[PDB]
Amino acid sequence: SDVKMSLSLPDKNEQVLFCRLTDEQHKVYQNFVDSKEVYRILNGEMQIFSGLIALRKICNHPDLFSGEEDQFGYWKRSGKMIVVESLLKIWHKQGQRVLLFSQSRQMLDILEVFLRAQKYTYLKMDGTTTIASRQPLITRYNEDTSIFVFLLTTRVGGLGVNLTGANRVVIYDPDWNPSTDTQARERAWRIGQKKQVTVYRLLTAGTIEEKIYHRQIFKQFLTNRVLKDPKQRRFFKSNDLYELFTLTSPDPLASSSLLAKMRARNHL
Amino acid sequence: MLGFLSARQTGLEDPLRLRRAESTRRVLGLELNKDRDVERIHGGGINTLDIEPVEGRYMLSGGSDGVIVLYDLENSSRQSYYTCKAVCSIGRDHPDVHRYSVETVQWYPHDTGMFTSSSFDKTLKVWDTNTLQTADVFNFEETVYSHHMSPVSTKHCLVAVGTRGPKVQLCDLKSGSCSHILQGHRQEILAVSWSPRYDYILATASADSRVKLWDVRRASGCLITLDQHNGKKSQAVESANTAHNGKVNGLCFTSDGLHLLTVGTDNRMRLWNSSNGENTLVNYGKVCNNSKKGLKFTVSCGCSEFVFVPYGSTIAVYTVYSGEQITMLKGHYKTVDCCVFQSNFQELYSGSRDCNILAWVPS
Ligand SMILES: [Mg+2]
């Protein structure tokens, strides 16, 4: 912001779409939050991780109960995948290049299958790809615009690489750490980006994903409290308790300036 | 001395000569004050004294009863006999009085409008001298043995605090930051003293028999560790390179800041080259101290240099660079805890466990 005017970067947008669980996805989510495992979690008997990861998987796509055109990972069974399908169609008809992130390798494979189901020319880079080929791959996506979508895991696709060839960026799945998402979204808006970029951060409304978004907003506020200014507004959207298992789908100083600073600080 | 005046008038000798020679002669003629007295207000022993660096008029004194008394040393009366009256007092009725003994009190350098006091109540309080109210308090997890503000720093305003913790705390007056600590000691840090010459050089003496010099700006620990033998008994640095054979409970940079005087519980004082910590092997004989806490001793200034060390119930005056014993100032009834030197008139003020502050004036 203090360098953007002195660097001639293009415009940026940071929209946050609140996606809607499908009937089948909503059914699986409601069945899980009504299951006995989450009940045991809320009683402190079991670790929270199983339920947390299960809910994140359900919001990503119902790959718990793998339900032709009914193969594993079919796009129409997940709301976020429906939104991604619409966005990819629009952007492809607009002749733009998209950077599709995911927290989960399995969800990245599902997105890859959905992309081959369409005619989109993709290019994938996750933790399994050999390191020696990663910088080449990036250069490929930065060089020829025939490649449309760049699939990424936020841990490898983020974190310092340059992907200015990408124009749109879509963060498919929120993470507990805000910084993962931040670096993933700044993979495109960098020195050398000659086109307007926008970030679409997909969350399922009233699910665990919205709660994770709230947790990481709280974390971002805590960070801004000490990085940019200490007048940060308190996080009031939620109390951040252990009720994220619920489905709530919508719808020289001369001793005087120094003494003054001492007096003012104590008064605070 | 008429020779000195004649040489000054005739330009034979620089007036510097007369000034420093007469300062030395006055210090040598130090004796129990004939016509001077100090008001008695401490119910317990005086652990520390500090005359303000600018104008040298007012003196702070912290007692073992926790009160802090502020005296005026100037003879505002017309008689030749006067008592150093107490201007102000953090007494037992003050809302912010220290709950336990005040062990170090220090005027803020560059200005007399503020002072600081550290106590065994685990607090370093910063007091506004005018309103006489605590401007700031810095709480510590363990009792404070000593503290010191840099007498030179126009840039930083750090207070180096030595507690029974093995860490030297650096409390920044600016943006109240007591988080900074220095690692490298192993037992209680009984004395701390900033270099009067170098802005960021701090000497710390701890009960592990070691004295360390730190550049507080630096990120790599202490600069120098003082070693008695300078290398004769050389070993990988885990327990060797000790400054003394006991607890080093007192530090004092010389007036120019080129040497460091360390007094330890092995009944020895040592003089160290402050630039590389080499022992100068000045003898000083046996300097009796058994204090379990910090020992406050000072050096002379503006003379042709002396060091005044508490020695039992006396003040031992030594020549810093030769070690020759000048004299014993003998007027206290119990062990002397502190002595502070008025450089303007070559005077001395000693506080001891007998609830007395005695003034020594040149005869
Ligand atoms: Mg980088």
Swiss-Prot record, chain A:
UniProt subunit comment: Homodimer. Binds DNA. Interacts with ERCC8. Interacts with RNA polymerase II; interaction is enhanced by UV irradiation. Component of the B-WICH complex, at least composed of SMARCA5/SNF2H, BAZ1B/WSTF, SF3B1, DEK, MYO1C, ERCC6, MYBBP1A and DDX21. Interacts with KIAA1530/UVSSA. Interacts with ELOA and CUL5; the interaction is induced by DNA damaging agents or by inhibitors of RNA polymerase II elongation. Interacts (via WHD region) with RIF1. Interacts with SMARCC2/BAF170, SMARCB1/BAF47 and the neuron-specific chromatin remodeling complex (nBAF complex).
Motif extent (CSA-interacting motif (CIM)): 255-267
Effect of W91R: In CSB; DNA-dependent ATPase-dead mutant; loss of chromatin remodeling activity; loss of its ability to inhibit non-homologous end joining-mediated repair and promote homologous recombination-mediated repair of DNA double-strand breaks; loss of its ability to suppress premature exit from G2/M checkpoint; abrogation of its UV-induced chromatin association
Role according to the record: Essential factor involved in transcription-coupled nucleotide excision repair (TC-NER), a process during which RNA polymerase II-blocking lesions are rapidly removed from the transcribed strand of active genes. Plays a central role in the initiation of the TC-NER process: specifically recognizes and binds RNA polymerase II stalled at a lesion, and mediates recruitment of ERCC8/CSA, initiating DNA damage excision by TFIIH recruitment.
Protein's name according to its UniProt entry: DNA excision repair protein ERCC-6
Disulphide-bridged cysteine pairs: none
Whole-protein coverage range: 748 to 1399 of 1493
Family according to the record: Belongs to the SNF2/RAD54 helicase family.
Localisation: Nucleus; Chromosome
Recorded name of the encoding gene: ERCC6
Involvement in disorder: Cockayne syndrome B: A rare disorder characterized by cutaneous sensitivity to sunlight, abnormal and slow growth, cachectic dwarfism, progeroid appearance, progressive pigmentary retinopathy and sensorineural deafness. There is delayed neural development and severe progressive neurologic degeneration resulting in intellectual disability. Cerebro-oculo-facio-skeletal syndrome 1: A disorder of prenatal onset characterized by microcephaly, congenital cataracts, facial dysmorphism, neurogenic arthrogryposis, growth failure and severe psychomotor retardation. COFS is considered to be part of the nucleotide-excision repair disorders spectrum that include also xeroderma pigmentosum, trichothiodystrophy and Cockayne syndrome.
Entry's free-text remark on domains: The CSA-interacting motif (CIM) mediates interaction and recruitment of ERCC8/CSA.
Curated annotation (Swiss-Prot), chain B:
Signal peptide span: none
GO MF terms, alphabetically ordered: ubiquitin-like ligase-substrate adaptor activity
PROSITE patterns linked: WD_REPEATS_1, WD_REPEATS_2, WD_REPEATS_REGION
GO biological process entries: DNA damage response; double-strand break repair via classical nonhomologous end joining; positive regulation of DNA repair; proteasome-mediated ubiquitin-dependent protein catabolic process; protein autoubiquitination; protein polyubiquitination; regulation of transcription-coupled nucleotide-excision repair; response to auditory stimulus
Positions of WD repeats: 33-73, 88-129, 133-173, 177-216, 235-274, 281-320, 324-362
Pathway stated in the Swiss-Prot or TrEMBL entry: Protein modification; protein ubiquitination
Cellular compartments per GO CC: Cul4-RING E3 ubiquitin ligase complex; Cul4A-RING E3 ubiquitin ligase complex; nuclear matrix; nucleoplasm; nucleotide-excision repair complex; nucleus; perikaryon; protein-containing complex
Subcellular location: Nucleus; Chromosome; Nucleus matrix
Keywords: Chromosome, Cockayne syndrome, Deafness, Disease variant, DNA damage, DNA repair, Dwarfism, Nucleus, Phosphoprotein, Repeat, Ubl conjugation pathway, WD repeat
Domain of life: Eukaryota
Subunit structure comment from the entry: Part of the CSA complex (also named DCX(ERCC8) complex), a DCX E3 ubiquitin-protein ligase complex containing ERCC8, RBX1, DDB1 and CUL4A; the CSA complex interacts with RNA polymerase II; upon UV irradiation it interacts with the COP9 signalosome and preferentially with the hyperphosphorylated form of RNA polymerase II. Interacts with ERCC6/CSB (via CIM motif); promoting recruitment to lesion-stalled RNA polymerase II (Pol II). Interacts with KIAA1530/UVSSA. Interacts with a subunit of RNA polymerase II TFIIH.
Record function comment: Substrate-recognition component of the CSA complex, a DCX (DDB1-CUL4-X-box) E3 ubiquitin-protein ligase complex, involved in transcription-coupled nucleotide excision repair (TC-NER), a process during which RNA polymerase II-blocking lesions are rapidly removed from the transcribed strand of active genes. Following recruitment to lesion-stalled RNA polymerase II (Pol II), the CSA complex mediates ubiquitination of Pol II subunit POLR2A/RPB1 at 'Lys-1268', a critical TC-NER checkpoint, governing RNA Pol II stability and initiating DNA damage excision by TFIIH recruitment.
Protein name in UniProt: DNA excision repair protein ERCC-8
Species lineage: Eukaryota, Metazoa, Chordata, Craniata, Vertebrata
